[PDB]
Each structure stands twice: as C-alpha cells, then as structure tokens.
mmCIF file of all heavy atoms in Angstrom:
data_model
loop_
_atom_site.group_PDB
_atom_site.id
_atom_site.type_symbol
_atom_site.label_atom_id
_atom_site.label_comp_id
_atom_site.label_asym_id
_atom_site.label_seq_id
_atom_site.Cartn_x
_atom_site.Cartn_y
_atom_site.Cartn_z
ATOM 1 N N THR A 118 0.821 -1.200 0.000
ATOM 2 C CA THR A 118 0.000 0.000 0.000
ATOM 3 C C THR A 118 0.862 1.260 0.000
ATOM 4 O O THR A 118 1.992 1.278 0.499
ATOM 5 C CB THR A 118 -0.941 0.013 1.205
ATOM 6 O OG1 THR A 118 -1.907 1.060 1.041
ATOM 7 C CG2 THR A 118 -0.167 0.246 2.489
ATOM 8 N N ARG A 119 0.307 2.317 -0.605
ATOM 9 C CA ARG A 119 0.894 3.663 -0.645
ATOM 10 C C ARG A 119 2.385 3.633 -0.993
ATOM 11 O O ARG A 119 3.163 4.494 -0.581
ATOM 12 C CB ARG A 119 0.639 4.410 0.668
ATOM 13 C CG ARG A 119 1.504 4.013 1.844
ATOM 14 C CD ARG A 119 1.209 4.902 3.026
ATOM 15 N NE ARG A 119 0.181 4.281 3.846
ATOM 16 C CZ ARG A 119 0.420 3.317 4.723
ATOM 17 N NH1 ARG A 119 1.652 2.923 4.992
ATOM 18 N NH2 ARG A 119 -0.601 2.734 5.341
ATOM 19 N N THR A 120 2.774 2.651 -1.798
ATOM 20 C CA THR A 120 4.157 2.488 -2.208
ATOM 21 C C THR A 120 4.186 2.377 -3.722
ATOM 22 O O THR A 120 3.263 1.826 -4.324
ATOM 23 C CB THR A 120 4.781 1.245 -1.566
ATOM 24 O OG1 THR A 120 4.569 1.284 -0.149
ATOM 25 C CG2 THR A 120 6.271 1.186 -1.845
ATOM 26 N N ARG A 121 5.248 2.898 -4.335
ATOM 27 C CA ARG A 121 5.409 2.798 -5.784
ATOM 28 C C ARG A 121 5.788 1.353 -6.096
ATOM 29 O O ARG A 121 6.915 1.029 -6.480
ATOM 30 C CB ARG A 121 6.448 3.792 -6.284
ATOM 31 C CG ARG A 121 6.523 3.904 -7.795
ATOM 32 C CD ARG A 121 7.869 4.454 -8.222
ATOM 33 N NE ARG A 121 8.280 5.576 -7.388
ATOM 34 C CZ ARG A 121 7.828 6.814 -7.526
ATOM 35 N NH1 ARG A 121 6.969 7.133 -8.479
ATOM 36 N NH2 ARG A 121 8.254 7.757 -6.691
ATOM 37 N N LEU A 122 4.809 0.468 -5.919
ATOM 38 C CA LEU A 122 5.000 -0.969 -6.054
ATOM 39 C C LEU A 122 3.650 -1.657 -6.197
ATOM 40 O O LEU A 122 2.771 -1.492 -5.346
ATOM 41 C CB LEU A 122 5.760 -1.522 -4.847
ATOM 42 C CG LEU A 122 6.270 -2.959 -4.942
ATOM 43 C CD1 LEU A 122 7.647 -3.068 -4.312
ATOM 44 C CD2 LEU A 122 5.300 -3.920 -4.275
ATOM 45 N N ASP A 123 3.477 -2.430 -7.264
ATOM 46 C CA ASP A 123 2.205 -3.091 -7.518
ATOM 47 C C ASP A 123 2.437 -4.228 -8.500
ATOM 48 O O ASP A 123 3.468 -4.280 -9.175
ATOM 49 C CB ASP A 123 1.166 -2.106 -8.065
ATOM 50 C CG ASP A 123 -0.220 -2.711 -8.157
ATOM 51 O OD1 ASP A 123 -0.864 -2.880 -7.102
ATOM 52 O OD2 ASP A 123 -0.662 -3.021 -9.282
ATOM 53 N N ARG A 124 1.463 -5.136 -8.567
ATOM 54 C CA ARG A 124 1.478 -6.249 -9.514
ATOM 55 C C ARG A 124 2.735 -7.104 -9.323
ATOM 56 O O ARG A 124 3.441 -7.456 -10.269
ATOM 57 C CB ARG A 124 1.341 -5.732 -10.953
ATOM 58 C CG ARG A 124 1.236 -6.795 -12.046
ATOM 59 C CD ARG A 124 0.242 -6.418 -13.139
ATOM 60 N NE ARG A 124 -1.050 -5.989 -12.614
ATOM 61 C CZ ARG A 124 -1.436 -4.726 -12.498
ATOM 62 N NH1 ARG A 124 -0.647 -3.728 -12.854
ATOM 63 N NH2 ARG A 124 -2.644 -4.460 -12.010
ATOM 64 N N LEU A 125 3.036 -7.403 -8.063
ATOM 65 C CA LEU A 125 4.062 -8.390 -7.759
ATOM 66 C C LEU A 125 3.502 -9.797 -7.922
ATOM 67 O O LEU A 125 2.417 -10.112 -7.428
ATOM 68 C CB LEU A 125 4.588 -8.198 -6.338
ATOM 69 C CG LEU A 125 5.678 -9.168 -5.880
ATOM 70 C CD1 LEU A 125 6.935 -9.003 -6.717
ATOM 71 C CD2 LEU A 125 5.978 -8.986 -4.400
ATOM 72 N N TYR A 126 4.252 -10.646 -8.612
ATOM 73 C CA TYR A 126 3.863 -12.032 -8.840
ATOM 74 C C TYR A 126 4.818 -12.940 -8.078
ATOM 75 O O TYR A 126 6.032 -12.902 -8.306
ATOM 76 C CB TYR A 126 3.870 -12.360 -10.331
ATOM 77 C CG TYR A 126 2.597 -11.961 -11.041
ATOM 78 C CD1 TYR A 126 2.435 -10.679 -11.541
ATOM 79 C CD2 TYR A 126 1.554 -12.861 -11.196
ATOM 80 C CE1 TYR A 126 1.273 -10.309 -12.187
ATOM 81 C CE2 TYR A 126 0.390 -12.499 -11.841
ATOM 82 C CZ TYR A 126 0.255 -11.220 -12.334
ATOM 83 O OH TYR A 126 -0.904 -10.852 -12.976
ATOM 84 N N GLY A 127 4.272 -13.747 -7.182
ATOM 85 C CA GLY A 127 5.056 -14.655 -6.362
ATOM 86 C C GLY A 127 4.683 -14.524 -4.899
ATOM 87 O O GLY A 127 4.358 -13.444 -4.404
ATOM 88 N N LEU A 128 4.747 -15.638 -4.184
ATOM 89 C CA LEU A 128 4.350 -15.653 -2.781
ATOM 90 C C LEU A 128 5.479 -15.116 -1.907
ATOM 91 O O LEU A 128 6.592 -15.649 -1.947
ATOM 92 C CB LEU A 128 3.969 -17.067 -2.354
ATOM 93 C CG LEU A 128 3.516 -17.326 -0.919
ATOM 94 C CD1 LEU A 128 2.355 -18.302 -0.922
ATOM 95 C CD2 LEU A 128 4.660 -17.890 -0.099
ATOM 96 N N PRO A 129 5.234 -14.069 -1.120
ATOM 97 C CA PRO A 129 6.289 -13.523 -0.255
ATOM 98 C C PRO A 129 6.412 -14.272 1.061
ATOM 99 O O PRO A 129 5.722 -15.271 1.284
ATOM 100 C CB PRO A 129 5.836 -12.078 -0.035
ATOM 101 C CG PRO A 129 4.350 -12.154 -0.108
ATOM 102 C CD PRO A 129 4.015 -13.244 -1.097
ATOM 103 N N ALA A 130 7.281 -13.788 1.949
ATOM 104 C CA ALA A 130 7.533 -14.429 3.233
ATOM 105 C C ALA A 130 6.787 -13.760 4.381
ATOM 106 O O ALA A 130 7.129 -13.983 5.546
ATOM 107 C CB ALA A 130 9.033 -14.448 3.527
ATOM 108 N N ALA A 131 5.775 -12.946 4.077
ATOM 109 C CA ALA A 131 5.079 -12.212 5.128
ATOM 110 C C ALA A 131 4.167 -13.130 5.934
ATOM 111 O O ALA A 131 4.354 -13.308 7.143
ATOM 112 C CB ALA A 131 4.281 -11.061 4.514
ATOM 113 N N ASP A 132 3.174 -13.727 5.278
ATOM 114 C CA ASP A 132 2.224 -14.612 5.951
ATOM 115 C C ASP A 132 1.850 -15.723 4.989
ATOM 116 O O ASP A 132 0.872 -15.616 4.236
ATOM 117 C CB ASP A 132 0.982 -13.859 6.423
ATOM 118 C CG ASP A 132 0.001 -14.756 7.147
ATOM 119 O OD1 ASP A 132 -0.878 -15.340 6.480
ATOM 120 O OD2 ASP A 132 0.110 -14.881 8.384
ATOM 121 N N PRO A 133 2.609 -16.809 4.981
ATOM 122 C CA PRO A 133 2.365 -17.876 4.001
ATOM 123 C C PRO A 133 1.333 -18.897 4.454
ATOM 124 O O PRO A 133 1.241 -19.982 3.871
ATOM 125 C CB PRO A 133 3.746 -18.517 3.844
ATOM 126 C CG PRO A 133 4.395 -18.305 5.170
ATOM 127 C CD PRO A 133 3.838 -17.037 5.758
ATOM 128 N N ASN A 134 0.551 -18.575 5.484
ATOM 129 C CA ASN A 134 -0.381 -19.543 6.046
ATOM 130 C C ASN A 134 -1.818 -19.057 6.156
ATOM 131 O O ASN A 134 -2.697 -19.880 6.434
ATOM 132 C CB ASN A 134 0.095 -19.991 7.435
ATOM 133 C CG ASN A 134 1.583 -20.269 7.475
ATOM 134 O OD1 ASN A 134 2.016 -21.409 7.315
ATOM 135 N ND2 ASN A 134 2.374 -19.228 7.695
ATOM 136 N N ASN A 135 -2.089 -17.766 5.963
ATOM 137 C CA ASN A 135 -3.439 -17.208 6.041
ATOM 138 C C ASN A 135 -4.105 -17.477 7.385
ATOM 139 O O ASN A 135 -5.335 -17.451 7.486
ATOM 140 C CB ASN A 135 -4.331 -17.738 4.911
ATOM 141 C CG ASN A 135 -4.091 -17.030 3.600
ATOM 142 O OD1 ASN A 135 -3.383 -17.537 2.730
ATOM 143 N ND2 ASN A 135 -4.687 -15.855 3.443
ATOM 144 N N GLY A 136 -3.319 -17.741 8.424
ATOM 145 C CA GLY A 136 -3.897 -18.097 9.701
ATOM 146 C C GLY A 136 -4.443 -19.503 9.770
ATOM 147 O O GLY A 136 -5.169 -19.831 10.712
ATOM 148 N N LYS A 137 -4.119 -20.348 8.795
ATOM 149 C CA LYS A 137 -4.584 -21.724 8.779
ATOM 150 C C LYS A 137 -3.652 -22.591 9.624
ATOM 151 O O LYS A 137 -2.788 -22.092 10.348
ATOM 152 C CB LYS A 137 -4.693 -22.232 7.342
ATOM 153 C CG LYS A 137 -5.665 -21.460 6.450
ATOM 154 C CD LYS A 137 -7.129 -21.704 6.816
ATOM 155 C CE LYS A 137 -7.684 -20.643 7.761
ATOM 156 N NZ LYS A 137 -9.136 -20.839 8.023
ATOM 157 N N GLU A 138 -3.822 -23.908 9.536
ATOM 158 C CA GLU A 138 -3.062 -24.852 10.342
ATOM 159 C C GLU A 138 -2.083 -25.681 9.529
ATOM 160 O O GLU A 138 -0.916 -25.812 9.914
ATOM 161 C CB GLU A 138 -4.022 -25.780 11.097
ATOM 162 C CG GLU A 138 -4.698 -25.127 12.282
ATOM 163 C CD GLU A 138 -3.758 -24.226 13.051
ATOM 164 O OE1 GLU A 138 -2.839 -24.754 13.712
ATOM 165 O OE2 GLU A 138 -3.935 -22.991 12.994
ATOM 166 N N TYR A 139 -2.524 -26.249 8.412
ATOM 167 C CA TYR A 139 -1.701 -27.175 7.649
ATOM 168 C C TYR A 139 -2.047 -27.053 6.172
ATOM 169 O O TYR A 139 -2.773 -26.147 5.753
ATOM 170 C CB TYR A 139 -1.899 -28.610 8.138
ATOM 171 C CG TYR A 139 -1.280 -28.910 9.484
ATOM 172 C CD1 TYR A 139 -2.073 -29.083 10.609
ATOM 173 C CD2 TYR A 139 0.095 -29.034 9.624
ATOM 174 C CE1 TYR A 139 -1.509 -29.364 11.842
ATOM 175 C CE2 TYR A 139 0.665 -29.315 10.851
ATOM 176 C CZ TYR A 139 -0.141 -29.478 11.956
ATOM 177 O OH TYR A 139 0.428 -29.756 13.177
ATOM 178 N N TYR A 140 -1.515 -27.983 5.382
ATOM 179 C CA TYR A 140 -1.787 -28.071 3.951
ATOM 180 C C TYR A 140 -1.998 -29.533 3.594
ATOM 181 O O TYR A 140 -1.057 -30.329 3.658
ATOM 182 C CB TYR A 140 -0.639 -27.474 3.133
ATOM 183 C CG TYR A 140 -0.703 -25.974 2.971
ATOM 184 C CD1 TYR A 140 0.457 -25.214 2.898
ATOM 185 C CD2 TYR A 140 -1.921 -25.315 2.885
ATOM 186 C CE1 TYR A 140 0.404 -23.844 2.747
ATOM 187 C CE2 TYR A 140 -1.983 -23.944 2.732
ATOM 188 C CZ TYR A 140 -0.816 -23.214 2.664
ATOM 189 O OH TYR A 140 -0.872 -21.848 2.513
ATOM 190 N N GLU A 141 -3.225 -29.886 3.225
ATOM 191 C CA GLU A 141 -3.560 -31.273 2.934
ATOM 192 C C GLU A 141 -3.128 -31.646 1.522
ATOM 193 O O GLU A 141 -3.608 -31.066 0.542
ATOM 194 C CB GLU A 141 -5.063 -31.499 3.100
ATOM 195 C CG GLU A 141 -5.507 -31.755 4.529
ATOM 196 C CD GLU A 141 -5.332 -33.202 4.945
ATOM 197 O OE1 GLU A 141 -5.063 -34.046 4.065
ATOM 198 O OE2 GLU A 141 -5.470 -33.496 6.151
ATOM 199 N N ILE A 142 -2.218 -32.612 1.417
ATOM 200 C CA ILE A 142 -1.802 -33.178 0.137
ATOM 201 C C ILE A 142 -1.779 -34.693 0.273
ATOM 202 O O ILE A 142 -1.058 -35.229 1.121
ATOM 203 C CB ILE A 142 -0.423 -32.671 -0.326
ATOM 204 C CG1 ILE A 142 -0.440 -31.160 -0.569
ATOM 205 C CG2 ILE A 142 0.031 -33.425 -1.563
ATOM 206 C CD1 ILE A 142 -0.114 -30.327 0.641
ATOM 207 N N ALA A 143 -2.553 -35.378 -0.561
ATOM 208 C CA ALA A 143 -2.601 -36.831 -0.584
ATOM 209 C C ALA A 143 -1.955 -37.354 -1.859
ATOM 210 O O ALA A 143 -1.719 -36.608 -2.812
ATOM 211 C CB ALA A 143 -4.045 -37.335 -0.482
ATOM 212 N N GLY A 144 -1.664 -38.649 -1.866
ATOM 213 C CA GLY A 144 -1.122 -39.257 -3.066
ATOM 214 C C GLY A 144 -0.670 -40.680 -2.825
ATOM 215 O O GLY A 144 -0.543 -41.141 -1.686
ATOM 216 N N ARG A 145 -0.423 -41.371 -3.936
ATOM 217 C CA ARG A 145 0.063 -42.741 -3.924
ATOM 218 C C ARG A 145 1.534 -42.778 -3.507
ATOM 219 O O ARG A 145 2.208 -41.748 -3.403
ATOM 220 C CB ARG A 145 -0.123 -43.377 -5.303
ATOM 221 C CG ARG A 145 -1.546 -43.850 -5.601
ATOM 222 C CD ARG A 145 -2.423 -42.722 -6.148
ATOM 223 N NE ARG A 145 -2.133 -42.387 -7.540
ATOM 224 C CZ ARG A 145 -2.514 -43.109 -8.584
ATOM 225 N NH1 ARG A 145 -3.204 -44.228 -8.438
ATOM 226 N NH2 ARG A 145 -2.198 -42.695 -9.808
ATOM 227 N N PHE A 146 2.038 -43.988 -3.268
ATOM 228 C CA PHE A 146 3.418 -44.161 -2.835
ATOM 229 C C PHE A 146 3.830 -45.612 -3.048
ATOM 230 O O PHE A 146 3.030 -46.526 -2.828
ATOM 231 C CB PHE A 146 3.580 -43.763 -1.365
ATOM 232 C CG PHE A 146 4.809 -44.320 -0.714
ATOM 233 C CD1 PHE A 146 6.068 -43.940 -1.142
ATOM 234 C CD2 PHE A 146 4.706 -45.220 0.330
ATOM 235 C CE1 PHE A 146 7.200 -44.449 -0.541
ATOM 236 C CE2 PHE A 146 5.832 -45.734 0.935
ATOM 237 C CZ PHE A 146 7.081 -45.348 0.500
ATOM 238 N N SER A 147 5.077 -45.816 -3.473
ATOM 239 C CA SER A 147 5.607 -47.147 -3.740
ATOM 240 C C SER A 147 7.012 -47.277 -3.165
ATOM 241 O O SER A 147 7.735 -46.288 -3.025
ATOM 242 C CB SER A 147 5.638 -47.445 -5.242
ATOM 243 O OG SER A 147 6.440 -46.500 -5.928
ATOM 244 N N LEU A 148 7.393 -48.514 -2.843
ATOM 245 C CA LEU A 148 8.686 -48.794 -2.234
ATOM 246 C C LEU A 148 8.973 -50.286 -2.350
ATOM 247 O O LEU A 148 8.101 -51.110 -2.070
ATOM 248 C CB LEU A 148 8.703 -48.328 -0.773
ATOM 249 C CG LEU A 148 10.005 -48.360 0.020
ATOM 250 C CD1 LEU A 148 10.002 -47.260 1.059
ATOM 251 C CD2 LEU A 148 10.128 -49.694 0.710
ATOM 252 N N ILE A 149 10.195 -50.625 -2.768
ATOM 253 C CA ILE A 149 10.523 -51.992 -3.162
ATOM 254 C C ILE A 149 11.770 -52.429 -2.386
ATOM 255 O O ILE A 149 12.591 -53.217 -2.868
ATOM 256 C CB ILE A 149 10.681 -52.065 -4.699
ATOM 257 C CG1 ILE A 149 11.165 -53.428 -5.212
ATOM 258 C CG2 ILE A 149 11.630 -50.982 -5.175
ATOM 259 C CD1 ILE A 149 10.974 -53.624 -6.698
ATOM 260 N N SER A 150 11.937 -51.902 -1.174
ATOM 261 C CA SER A 150 13.145 -52.158 -0.398
ATOM 262 C C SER A 150 13.343 -53.650 -0.126
ATOM 263 O O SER A 150 12.447 -54.475 -0.314
ATOM 264 C CB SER A 150 13.098 -51.406 0.930
ATOM 265 O OG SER A 150 13.960 -52.009 1.880
ATOM 266 N N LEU A 151 14.547 -53.985 0.341
ATOM 267 C CA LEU A 151 14.947 -55.364 0.577
ATOM 268 C C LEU A 151 15.463 -55.537 2.000
ATOM 269 O O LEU A 151 15.610 -54.573 2.756
ATOM 270 C CB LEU A 151 16.028 -55.817 -0.414
ATOM 271 C CG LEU A 151 17.458 -55.298 -0.255
ATOM 272 C CD1 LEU A 151 18.409 -56.160 -1.065
ATOM 273 C CD2 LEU A 151 17.574 -53.855 -0.700
ATOM 274 N N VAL A 152 15.741 -56.790 2.349
ATOM 275 C CA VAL A 152 16.191 -57.161 3.687
ATOM 276 C C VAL A 152 17.346 -58.148 3.559
ATOM 277 O O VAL A 152 17.363 -58.960 2.622
ATOM 278 C CB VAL A 152 15.028 -57.751 4.507
ATOM 279 C CG1 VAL A 152 14.514 -59.030 3.863
ATOM 280 C CG2 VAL A 152 15.440 -58.006 5.946
ATOM 281 N N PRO A 153 18.341 -58.110 4.452
ATOM 282 C CA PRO A 153 19.370 -59.158 4.444
ATOM 283 C C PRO A 153 18.849 -60.463 5.018
ATOM 284 O O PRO A 153 19.127 -60.799 6.174
ATOM 285 C CB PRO A 153 20.483 -58.564 5.312
ATOM 286 C CG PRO A 153 19.782 -57.603 6.206
ATOM 287 C CD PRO A 153 18.689 -57.009 5.365
ATOM 288 N N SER A 154 18.093 -61.206 4.218
ATOM 289 C CA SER A 154 17.453 -62.413 4.709
ATOM 290 C C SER A 154 18.467 -63.537 4.890
ATOM 291 O O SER A 154 19.560 -63.530 4.319
ATOM 292 C CB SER A 154 16.343 -62.857 3.759
ATOM 293 O OG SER A 154 15.736 -64.054 4.212
ATOM 294 N N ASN A 155 18.081 -64.517 5.700
ATOM 295 C CA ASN A 155 18.951 -65.633 6.038
ATOM 296 C C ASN A 155 18.952 -66.652 4.901
ATOM 297 O O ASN A 155 18.365 -66.441 3.836
ATOM 298 C CB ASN A 155 18.515 -66.253 7.361
ATOM 299 C CG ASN A 155 19.638 -66.988 8.058
ATOM 300 O OD1 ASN A 155 20.806 -66.622 7.933
ATOM 301 N ND2 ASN A 155 19.292 -68.036 8.798
ATOM 302 N N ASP A 156 19.626 -67.781 5.124
ATOM 303 C CA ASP A 156 19.677 -68.836 4.121
ATOM 304 C C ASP A 156 18.311 -69.471 3.896
ATOM 305 O O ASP A 156 17.966 -69.809 2.758
ATOM 306 C CB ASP A 156 20.685 -69.902 4.540
ATOM 307 C CG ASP A 156 20.487 -70.354 5.974
ATOM 308 O OD1 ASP A 156 19.627 -69.771 6.666
ATOM 309 O OD2 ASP A 156 21.190 -71.291 6.409
ATOM 310 N N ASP A 157 17.528 -69.639 4.956
ATOM 311 C CA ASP A 157 16.269 -70.358 4.869
ATOM 312 C C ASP A 157 15.198 -69.490 4.211
ATOM 313 O O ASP A 157 15.410 -68.314 3.903
ATOM 314 C CB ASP A 157 15.828 -70.815 6.256
ATOM 315 C CG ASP A 157 16.930 -71.535 7.007
ATOM 316 O OD1 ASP A 157 17.861 -72.043 6.348
ATOM 317 O OD2 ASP A 157 16.863 -71.593 8.252
#
C-alpha cells in the first residue's frame, strides 16, 4: 500500500499460512526395499 509498487507475482515471506493450520496433500506411494534375509 501507498508504495510505488504493484502487480508483484510470487508468494512472499510475510504470511504464508493465512492463519490456517496445515496443507492437505494426498497421493500414492511405492517402495521396493529389501532385507538381508537368512539362508532359509
């Protein structure tokens, strides 16, 4: 406001939460890890 500055594009570091709590993001997930299994 009242500044020679307008039409900034990009989210600043002032208040990135709007007074909310979290950000819900869901999605699938995969993993194929292994184990040092025994002989048997």
Side-chain angles (χ1 to χ4, degrees):
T118 191
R119 77 176 92 81
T120 308
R121 189 202 316 281
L122 191 141
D123 188 74
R124 184 141 311 101
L125 180 64
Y126 276 86
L128 180 139
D132 181 270
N134 316 265
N135 280 99
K137 299 289 95 176
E138 285 320 290
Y139 288 108
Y140 276 147
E141 277 277 349
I142 297 89
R145 281 85 75 76
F146 161 65
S147 59
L148 187 150
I149 174 165
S150 158
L151 74 164
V152 63
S154 178
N155 204 31
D156 49 355
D157 310 338

